[PDB]
């Protein structure tokens, strides 16, 4: 099975196809995948259970195919639709914040999130 | 249908046209030299 | 090849550079702006 | 004439060597394709056209060698 | 910057079509303070 | 000699008309559809404004 | 006068027909044929705004458009099996390349003075090898002169010759007895495949012309 | 307003709609096209902003 | 003549060199296949058609080379 | 006389070997494109102009070599 | 004389072609070993892939070899 | 006679040097594409360096080409 | 006379071969420069002078080769 989960909420916790954005670029898992450990980067994620496809916006986490075909995906607070327009407004604010702004790292993340939003 | 709208970029294309003229003359001279064995 | 050595180089080149100047003007003043008419017409439709 | 004709036939064989580079080239493009598809499971819709474009271009440099080869051989 | 802190800031940015809930907002707002200590001796409870 | 080349050209156009030409018809159609739908949508939109 | 003159006229007439006999008196709805010339417009808009984007790109957009369409049409026309050397008269294509190269060099000298030669200083690098990097930058800069023409010329010429030589061989397979005419068709199928490849690479080469002479114009307009 | 609504109903092509009809309805069409040629741009963000746009590349 | 006959037997040999490239090329396509399947075991049913395609195309450049050898050998 | 003409054709054959390098070169640029896209598909539109540019620049060296071949052949 | 010499010479040239096949076989086996060593488990499907790959690389070499024999013997 | 032949042969051999440049240019461009796909945002710094690397790789090939002209013409 | 002069020209052609290695060489140094810099965003200030050293050293081999070619031709 597939374990797709958040701390406070818990989703799908192998499922047909899962498409993952990782430090190794992009990784695809289809049925059995050979067992990996990959850190999930801040992401646009696709999980497909059968032909049905569900599209996820993910705050990064960790990915681990277990040898027994358990794709453990753990991530913080995600939905893709939930993330969306208010975020476009925020991104303007975030650009301002990037100007002033650990604060450097925060601003770097703000740029990353802005990019991650452009992906939506 | 067909409509002419003037493009004033023909004076932007002055070095391009000048290059065409130089080569035009040069190919006359080149043709004469190659038509002589 | 004999199809790469004519003596007609300047003859060819005359007709050649004439075609270039012709097509350039033809596109630039005529045929490019009628596509820009499609663009502008679409933008007027965008407004209403 | 025997000399010129022999020179052509030898020279043709020499030109044939040039084809080898394109041949390896084809494998390299296709290897990239196979690796890429294995990475995503799903990149293939974008990438498969890129692979065809690359294949054709590598192949073309090879064919230019072949056309010189045939220019000596037949011609 | 620690990996989970890095992910954390991203998660905070991520709580911004829209579909907003209390648990999310709570997950991105905390009033907690961290009190450094030494020795007994206490450098202040800087806001977390 | 060159009639062999013409036979090849006849084959080339045959494959093109087989595979590419219905695809290009469909492609052209697809774009036309999208344009038309947007165009007509705009007409609806200004009609709404009059009513408002 | 020449055969060459007759096919240059034919190119002009094909190009006239795409902005005359392809639209239905300019419907906004669009015509199936006119959608093709929309996409060409869009991909050269987005290519030359991408290459020679700056404060202008539209000022050199017609020039890049008539360089697109000429090569785009002339590698279909030159690929009709009874059509004469235009582009396969290499002297016209290479000459066109050299003209554009000189028209860039002159444009750069005129617009950007004698600090045009700062184009041939490429980067801030250690000073004892700064002059060396000028010498073998200018060497490569007028390698741009002959490369642009020679790409197109080699591709088109080699394609036609390859097909004709192989056609001549399959002619002689089928000029001797029917057992040779059997497995005389197996190489013939190779010529058909080569012709498919040659049509494809001529449109690819056409994109390569207009991107390269956008890239050179990017360099020429924007120094370094 | 009754008349304005009626005018949209009784005068409105969208089949045989041509740019010739829009040039006739506003000389703004030709004014903008010429101004754009003078501008040295040919990108209108409306041809792509809601109207279909595709680049081959 | 002797020169021409010599040219055929030698020239054939010269052509044979090009073939080495195709041999290497083939190995590269297969290497990519193995690596691909290693990376995702279920990629195989899609990928195996791609692999045979890559093999054939790389092989084709080799074929053109091998033909020139045979043309000199038996012509 | 035969020697001069023979040598012309020999020198031509010999030059053709240089093209093989460019054939490998085209494949390498395209391999990078495919690998890049599969490793980050968001890059694809930004990269596509640079990729085509690099292919062309690679191809040119082989065609320079080929131009010497024609320089010998035509004289 | 020249023709008999040419047979022996021709054969020698043909021997060069084999070098590529030798490298080719090795690369396939290297890929087998790497794929297997990474997974512990891809092997049962992959082992026939590796044998096939060996054979095809070898086959191109064989074409070089038979041309060597043909030129030597006639 | 033999001298005329010799320059034609010598020109042929010198041109082979270009092979190295064709591979070379591609390795630089490959690394550009690989680098930019890895980083995304590196491209602004890297693209000038890559064009420099291209120029230098090409430059060796132009030397090969120039030797050919020095034999043939000179 | 003719043979000795010929041997200069032919020998020069053979001499030019060594240059191919340097072409590949420069590229290999630059590839690593690009790869390293793309990894760090910030290694570049240390790595760039190191890279110029590597370039010069790889290039030098090419210059030695060119020198021998010139010794035959000019010398």
Numbering used by the authors:
A (entry chain H): 11 to 23, 26 to 90, 92 to 97, 99 to 115, 118 to 136
B (entry chain Y): 1 to 37
C (entry chain Z): 1 to 48
D (entry chain 1), I (entry chain 0), J (entry chain 2), M (entry chain 4): 1 to 75
E (entry chain I): 8 to 23, 27 to 49, 53 to 61
F (entry chain U): 54 to 105
G (entry chain T): 26 to 249
H (entry chain V): 117 to 173
Give verbatim excerpts from the published study on this entry.
We purified S. cerevisiae ATP synthase with the detergent n-Dodecyl-β-D-Maltopyranoside (DDM), which results in a monomeric preparation of the enzyme, and determined its structure by cryoEM. Three-dimensional (3D) classification allowed particle images to be separated into six rotor positions, corresponding to the catalytic and binding dwells for each of the three main rotational states. Further classification of the State 1catalytic conformation resulted in classes distinguished by variability in the position of the peripheral stalk and a slight rotation of the rotor relative to subunit a. These classes were designated as State 1catalytic(a) (light blue) to State 1catalytic(d) (dark blue) in order of increasing straightening of the peripheral stalk (‘no ATP’ condition). As these structures were determined in the absence of free ATP, they likely represent energetically similar conformations that can be reached by thermal fluctuation of the enzyme structure.
ATP synthases use a transmembrane electrochemical proton motive force (pmf) to generate adenosine triphosphate (ATP) from adenosine diphosphate (ADP) and inorganic phosphate (Pi). ATP synthases are macromolecular machines consisting of an ATP-hydrolysis-driven F1 motor and a proton-translocation-driven FO motor. The F1 and FO motors oppose each other’s action on a shared rotor subcomplex and are held stationary relative to each other by a peripheral stalk. In Saccharomyces cerevisiae, the FO region contains subunits a, e, f, g, i/j, k, 8, part of subunit b, and the c10-ring of the rotor, while the F1 region includes a trimer of catalytic subunit αβ pairs and subunits γ, δ, and ε from the rotor.
